Design a protein around this nucleic acid. Structure first.
Lengths: 121, 53, 113, 121, 214
RNA sequence: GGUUUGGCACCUCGAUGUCGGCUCAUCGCAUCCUGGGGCUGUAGUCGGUCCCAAGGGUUGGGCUGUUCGCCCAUUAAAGCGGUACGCGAGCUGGGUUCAGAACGUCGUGAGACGUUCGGUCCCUAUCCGUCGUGGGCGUAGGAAAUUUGAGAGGAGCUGUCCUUAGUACGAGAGGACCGGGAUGGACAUACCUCUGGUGUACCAGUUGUCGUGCCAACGGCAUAGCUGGGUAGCUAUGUGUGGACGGGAUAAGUGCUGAAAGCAUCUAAGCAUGAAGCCCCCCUCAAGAUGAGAUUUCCCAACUUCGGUUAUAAGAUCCCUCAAAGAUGAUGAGGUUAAUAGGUUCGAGGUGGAAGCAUGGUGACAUGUGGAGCUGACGAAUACUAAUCGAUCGAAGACUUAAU
């Protein structure tokens, strides 16, 4: 219980795992305000497992990320666990906290939702 | 439960004194030179100017 | 804790006591006032509950007295406990043992180490 | 916490067994009692060969309980069985022996015979 | 005879010397200054006025209530103190206090065992006819009257609701006092009173610890 | 007197739809308890009657649809009545009064008046009323705090035990008044340190079956899959507090002096005393109290003939980061002169020995590296991330008369 979202305590656990593993890939996503005042509390507890680089932590981070596959390493595969411990966990090895930021776009049309852009700093 | 009387035109217009919308709270985006809603980015060319976004 | 509650409650935090964990069979000496003297009465049993919380931590020790089981909970820093000494050490896989409040006589045994 | 129609063992050889509760003696509107108060029991089960027969309004004192009492030092006590002792018209127990550890609270100068018969107190 | 102001910290327990066990409340009392002295010479009653937990001085772009503004700084200039945040006022005292700002000592309640603690309340906000007034509720198996108030009035010989019925609304926040609490242990170098028993407020609250009247 | 059974047929048949108990009240005095007296065929404990007295209190069950009622265990006491025989746009539908069926009985007959088994209880609150909580303007300049209390709410109950005293009074048995102390019952309010409850982004064991290519490790789904513990918060059965003692005027009554009425006489003139009741004392709201109070403190000019303006000052606010506050608005802690949230590094609490490797064994599993690892809400620390740049509202102090 950090903050509920209208999801039924079972969907909210598997919704943040759909925003985290699509933020280490695209490096920025466009979403609503309250879906991105909580995913800054997940992906900053997950680059911390990137700065360790253990065997326990390569397993203990895999239970909050999906298994997707990335193609353009000039035609070389890169699983989203391997994009961390890698080009993500080496960009921030001397910044102690504060990996994300939230940029408010505007209210979206026809729903009135305060859209924001989260992006890795 | 139903109304007992037909509510008049004096009592109707009084009840929507407080039924209105408020001004947006705009600023002047100092690089492009437009209006934008404050603490938000510009929809045109425009920086955040504490962040240059 | 708050570092102002903690700085006032360090004279009332009496430390001369041994260390233990649940699954151990202690031997308490209390100091009752019931009588012409002010006598010291023992109590012997196995420990169930915690030893943490701060200056308010309490343990819990039970025994099978004469058919009917009894329990006693003591504040750990009382002036009424004379001393505490240990009989035997167990292996219980738990932190609080409430399952001995229904087991009879040879199912309420705990092995040694 | 005893009530208005709970059952209790009897812990002596007064010719009785499980007795009910009728009413809790004290003030008016009183709804609970604990160790060392009088009640009005009625015998719902009896040992054949006793001096109290089944269906007979007798008093008692609550001697043990599963709730317990809190003392002056903050020490608690918890038995694992409810029990009482049938008491005569003046304060002294009807039976002869008492088959259990009575509570340490029980006497005040008043029940100076029930604590003089227990195996331990 | 007078009192101090205090910010609630928490609750733990001490032991008595005889073997007892006192649950107690930690109430700290930092810098308290007598800010004026209202007398019957000028218009009114007889009283003094204390302050508590001073603020910062002044700033040009003073944005919020951290810094002291211009009207509440000249008031704390005649009594040559720092600008205090929580200002309250105590009657039925002596004139032992100077009108100029001297500090009110925490060492004046060393055995005074008549204490009224005047907090606010915790302010629950959870409304409702049962939980506010402690009313009963109907049967949750046979009938229907699960949690509700009942008759709000008698019938058509009255044909009104009497002023002062019991209906839902915002519960909690009303100032209450508790009477005849005692003091366990005063302190220096922490400025902490240990007042026996609970006090009416949330943590980081504000209490007013004055000597009882009964 | 207007509660019972009635008498009259005035209001409602284009609806006034009927008994008891739950929920929540509120009023009367013709008083059941407690407070103060007067007689007594009142020795003392208990009682009986009658007068002043409405401040609070007035139990838990069996049998009946029950109204009455009868009984059982208590208790200081288990008061009688009005409010549409209080309350069904708050609940119940057992009952009374629907269609089915059966008995007894009456009827030649269809059917009928005492019992019996079953039998749909509808509605989104416009106005007055009530409980909360915000805008506007007013209090002769504009603002930040602190308060007097006109009036109005809240509270009000009382048991038992020891001592004065086995004294007073009594043939005995029995056994006090007025006082002085301790300790509980029910009710009200506050709080989470203690015993306990919940704790659905916390920790651990375990069944089924798909997935991560496989062994090892883990994710999904089965009420949260089930089971054992559980921090903050929110709570009671838990822990603290309360009704204290006074003061002024009175009722029934007991009085002192005293005439009408040479005496007598509580009264008509004058004076004392007297109750849980009345007005204050204690706790809370309160200057819209248009009779709109009071004390400290802050800001005070450039204009124009526009006789009065336009703006800024002191001060608040939209906007964003939030809670000790919360339906929303409000209150409160903050906005780079920055510790208000998030991360981070340290702990406290919670679980109870992580994975990998090393050793033991045929394997299940066990020991050691290690009070280990993981850890949502509570305590500290450091500007790394977001509270940016900015905007809108807001004074110039009227007149008359006695003082200076």
């Amino acid at each position: 219980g950090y903050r509920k979202l209208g999801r039924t305590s079972d969907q909210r656990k598997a919704m943040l795992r759909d925003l985290a593993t699509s933020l280490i890939i695209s490096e920025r996503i466009e979403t609503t305000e309250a879906r991105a005042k909580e995913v800054r509390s997940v992906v900053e507890k997950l680059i911390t497992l990137g700065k360790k680089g253990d065997l326990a932590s390569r397993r203990n981070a895999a239970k909050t990320l999906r298994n997707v596959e990335i193609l353009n390493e000039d035609e070389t595969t890169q699983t989203a666990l391997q994009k961390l411990f890698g080009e993500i966990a080496e960009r921030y090895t001397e910044r102690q906290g504060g990996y994300t930021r939230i940029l408010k776009q505007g209210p979206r049309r026809g729903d009135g939702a305060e859209s924001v852009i989260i992006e890795l700093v | 439960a139903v109304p007992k009387r037909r509510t008049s035109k004096t009592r109707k217009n009084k009840r929507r004194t407080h039924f209105k919308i408020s001004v947006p709270g705009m600023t002047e985006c100092p690089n492009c030179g437009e209006y934008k809603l404050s603490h938000r980015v510009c929809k045109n060319c425009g920086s955040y100017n504490g962040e240059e976004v | 804790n708050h570092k102002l509650i903690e700085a006032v409650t360090k004279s009332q935090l009496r430390t001369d006591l041994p260390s233990f964990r649940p699954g151990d069979t202690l031997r308490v000496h209390v100091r009752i006032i019931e009588g012409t003297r002010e006598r010291i009465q023992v109590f012997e049993g196995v420990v169930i509950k915690r030893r943490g919380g701060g200056v308010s931590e309490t343990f819990t020790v039970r025994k099978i007295s004469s058919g009917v089981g009894v329990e006693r909970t003591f504040p750990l820093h009382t002036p009424k406990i004379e001393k505490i000494e240990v009989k035997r050490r167990g292996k219980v896989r738990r932190a609080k043992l409430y399952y001995l409040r229904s087991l009879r006589g040879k199912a309420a045994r705990i092995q040694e180490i | 916490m005893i009530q208005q129609e709970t059952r209790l063992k009897v812990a002596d050889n007064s010719g009785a067994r499980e007795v009910l509760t009728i009413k809790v003696l004290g003030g008016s509107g009183r709804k609970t009692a604990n160790i060392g108060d009088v009640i009005v029991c009625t015998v719902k089960n009896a040992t054949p060969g006793g001096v109290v027969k089944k269906g007979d309004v007798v008093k008692a004192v609550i001697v043990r309980t599963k709730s317990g009492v809190r003392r002056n030092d903050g020490s608690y006590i918890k038995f694992d069985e409810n029990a009482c002792v049938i008491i005569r018209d003046d304060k002294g127990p009807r039976g002869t022996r008492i088959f259990g550890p009575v509570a340490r609270e029980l006497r005040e100068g008043n029940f100076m015979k029930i604590v003089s018969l227990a195996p331990e107190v | 005879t007078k009192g101090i102001l205090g910010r609630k910290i928490g609750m733990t327990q001490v032991f008595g010397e005889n073997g007892e066990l006192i649950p107690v409340t930690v109430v700290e009392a930092k810098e308290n200054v007598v800010l004026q002295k209202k007398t019957v010479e000028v218009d009114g009653y007889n009283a003094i006025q204390v302050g508590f937990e001073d603020k910062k001085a002044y700033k040009k772009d003073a944005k919020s209530n951290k810094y002291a503004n211009k009207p509440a700084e000249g008031h704390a200039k005649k009594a040559d103190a720092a600008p205090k945040r929580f200002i309250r006022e105590f009657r039925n005292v002596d004139v032992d206090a100077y009108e100029v700002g001297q500090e009110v000592s925490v060492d004046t309640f060393v055995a005074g065992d008549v204490i009224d603690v005047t907090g606010v309340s915790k302010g629950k906000g959870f409304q409702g006819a049962i939980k506010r007034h402690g009313q009963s509720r109907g049967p949750m198996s046979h009938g229907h009257f699960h949690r509700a108030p009942g008759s709000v009035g008698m019938a058509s010989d009255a044909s009104r609701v009497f002023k002062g019925q019991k209906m839902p609304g915002r519960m909690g926040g009303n100032t209450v006092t508790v009477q005849n609490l005692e003091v366990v242990q005063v302190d220096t170098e922490n400025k902490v009173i240990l007042v026996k028993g609970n006090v009416p407020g949330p943590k980081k609250g504000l209490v007013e610890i004055r000597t009882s009247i009964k």
